[PDB]
Design an enzyme around this catalytic site. Structure first.
Site, PDB file in Angstrom:
ATOM      1  CG  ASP A   1       4.872  -0.700  -8.502  1.00 25.14           C
ATOM      2  OD1 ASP A   1       5.720  -0.576  -9.420  1.00 25.14           O
ATOM      3  OD2 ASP A   1       5.160  -0.938  -7.298  1.00 25.14           O
TER       4      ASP A   1
ATOM      5  CD1 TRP B   1       4.145   3.128  -5.052  1.00 21.47           C
ATOM      6  CD2 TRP B   1       3.061   3.188  -7.035  1.00 21.47           C
ATOM      7  NE1 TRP B   1       5.091   3.016  -6.052  1.00 21.47           N
ATOM      8  CE2 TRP B   1       4.460   3.055  -7.273  1.00 21.47           C
ATOM      9  CE3 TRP B   1       2.191   3.259  -8.139  1.00 21.47           C
ATOM     10  CZ2 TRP B   1       5.002   2.958  -8.558  1.00 21.47           C
ATOM     11  CZ3 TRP B   1       2.734   3.198  -9.422  1.00 21.47           C
ATOM     12  CH2 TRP B   1       4.127   3.039  -9.623  1.00 21.47           C
TER      13      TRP B   1
ATOM     14  CE  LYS C   1       6.677  -3.001 -11.480  1.00 21.29           C
ATOM     15  NZ  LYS C   1       6.994  -3.059 -10.015  1.00 21.29           N
TER      16      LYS C   1
ATOM     17  N   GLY D   1       0.743  -1.264   0.000  1.00 24.05           N
ATOM     18  CA  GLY D   1       0.000   0.000   0.000  1.00 24.05           C
ATOM     19  C   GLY D   1       0.761   1.295   0.000  1.00 24.05           C
TER      20      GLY D   1
ATOM     21  CG  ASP E   1      -2.181  -6.491  -5.015  1.00 26.69           C
ATOM     22  OD1 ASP E   1      -2.108  -7.739  -5.025  1.00 26.69           O
ATOM     23  OD2 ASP E   1      -1.187  -5.771  -5.188  1.00 26.69           O
TER      24      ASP E   1
HETATM   25  C1  LIG Z   1       5.690  -4.534  -6.317  1.00 22.03           C
HETATM   26  S1  LIG Z   1       4.046  -4.967  -5.727  1.00 22.03           S
HETATM   27  C2  LIG Z   1       3.356  -3.303  -5.627  1.00 22.03           C
HETATM   28  C3  LIG Z   1       3.917  -2.432  -4.504  1.00 22.03           C
HETATM   29  C4  LIG Z   1       2.993  -1.221  -4.324  1.00 22.03           C
HETATM   30  N1  LIG Z   1       3.139  -0.304  -5.505  1.00 22.03           N
HETATM   31  C5  LIG Z   1       3.290  -0.500  -3.009  1.00 22.03           C
HETATM   32  O1  LIG Z   1       3.882   0.580  -3.042  1.00 22.03           O
HETATM   33  O2  LIG Z   1       2.935  -0.940  -1.908  1.00 22.03           O
HETATM   34  C6  LIG Z   1       3.267  -5.623  -7.226  1.00 22.03           C
HETATM   35  C7  LIG Z   1       1.839  -6.091  -6.939  1.00 22.03           C
HETATM   36  O3  LIG Z   1       1.204  -6.365  -8.190  1.00 22.03           O
HETATM   37  C8  LIG Z   1       0.170  -7.304  -7.885  1.00 22.03           C
HETATM   38  N2  LIG Z   1      -0.362  -7.866  -9.128  1.00 22.03           N
HETATM   39  C9  LIG Z   1       0.281  -8.639 -10.074  1.00 22.03           C
HETATM   40  N3  LIG Z   1      -0.584  -8.897 -11.077  1.00 22.03           N
HETATM   41  C10 LIG Z   1      -1.763  -8.291 -10.779  1.00 22.03           C
HETATM   42  C11 LIG Z   1      -2.990  -8.207 -11.438  1.00 22.03           C
HETATM   43  N4  LIG Z   1      -3.185  -8.801 -12.607  1.00 22.03           N
HETATM   44  N5  LIG Z   1      -4.023  -7.497 -10.881  1.00 22.03           N
HETATM   45  C12 LIG Z   1      -3.875  -6.851  -9.667  1.00 22.03           C
HETATM   46  N6  LIG Z   1      -2.658  -6.918  -9.016  1.00 22.03           N
HETATM   47  C13 LIG Z   1      -1.634  -7.639  -9.558  1.00 22.03           C
HETATM   48  C14 LIG Z   1       0.805  -8.293  -6.925  1.00 22.03           C
HETATM   49  O4  LIG Z   1      -0.173  -9.039  -6.208  1.00 22.03           O
HETATM   50  C15 LIG Z   1       1.715  -7.380  -6.090  1.00 22.03           C
HETATM   51  O5  LIG Z   1       1.150  -7.105  -4.826  1.00 22.03           O
END
Ligand SMILES: C[S@@+](CC[C@H](N)C(=O)[O-])C[C@H]1O[C@@H](n2cnc3c(N)ncnc32)[C@H](O)[C@@H]1O
Length: 182
Positions: A101, A35, A141, A33, A54
């Site tokens: 992200d 962002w 990203k 969380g 997410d």
């Molecule tokens: C690097 S983490 C994000 C960190 C977040 N930006 C933060 O600051 O807390 C990447 C996230 O993308 C999610 N994710 C991957 N594919 C997804 C999708 N198709 N739909 C929703 N979330 C997805 C993962 O579950 C993961 O929690």
């Protein structure tokens, strides 16, 4: 901050200045969380709606709407649940800023991981097109690679401008400004 990922959004907003008053903002791949936290900070005395999506359940953040769902699966229109949760929140409105992200787990074969990243980017882009407001900003990203420029060109077909950020399996963001539709 719940993650050091916050500093990537701070860098992005510092350079591209998109977090503004009276905007509806969606943060895709929001877990855990940070962002969402940065978005809260930068819009502190502004009216906004901040939504996080997410596949993993995020601990609640005051004044942030969370939706558990996998984009490309739990939204109905891909290449109901996310959509109906968005409907509850937005009613008849579209979303001004859509950030992603999100990333797919790496299998440790660079080219396959890039293609998988492309696939995710396409899923998120397809979903974005449905929900983005005219004039809206979209930042997504992906793992940089052979198809990145194809995707950039595709996005240039629906936004006034599209920028690739500096690489950081290297990752970049595609920064898309002023949604115009196709
Ligand atoms: C690097 S983490 C994000 C960190 C977040 N930006 C933060 O600051 O807390 C990447 C996230 O993308 C999610 N994710 C991957 N594919 C997804 C999708 N198709 N739909 C929703 N979330 C997805 C993962 O579950 C993961 O929690």
């Amino acid at each position: 901050y719940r993650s050091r990922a916050a500093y990537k959004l701070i860098e992005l907003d510092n350079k591209y200045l998109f977090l503004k008053k009276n905007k509806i903002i969606l943060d895709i791949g929001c877990y855990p969380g940070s962002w969402c936290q940065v978005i809260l900070e930068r819009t502190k005395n502004y009216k906004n709606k901040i939504i996080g999506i997410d596949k993993k359940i995020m601990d609640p953040i005051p004044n942030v709407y969370f939706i558990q769902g996998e984009i490309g699966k739990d939204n109905m229109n891909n290449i109901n649940s996310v959509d109906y949760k968005l409907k509850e929140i937005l009613q008849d409105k579209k979303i001004d800023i859509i950030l992603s992200d999100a990333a797919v787990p790496c299998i440790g074969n660079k080219i396959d991981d890039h293609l998988n990243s492309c696939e995710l980017t396409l899923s998120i882009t397809h979903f974005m097109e449905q929900y983005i407001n005219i004039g809206g900003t979209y930042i997504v990203k992906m793992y940089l690679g052979s198809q990145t420029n194809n995707l950039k060109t595709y996005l240039k077909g629906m936004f006034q401008l599209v920028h690739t950020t500096k690489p950081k399996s290297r990752e970049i963001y595609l920064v898309c400004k002023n949604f115009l539709g196709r």
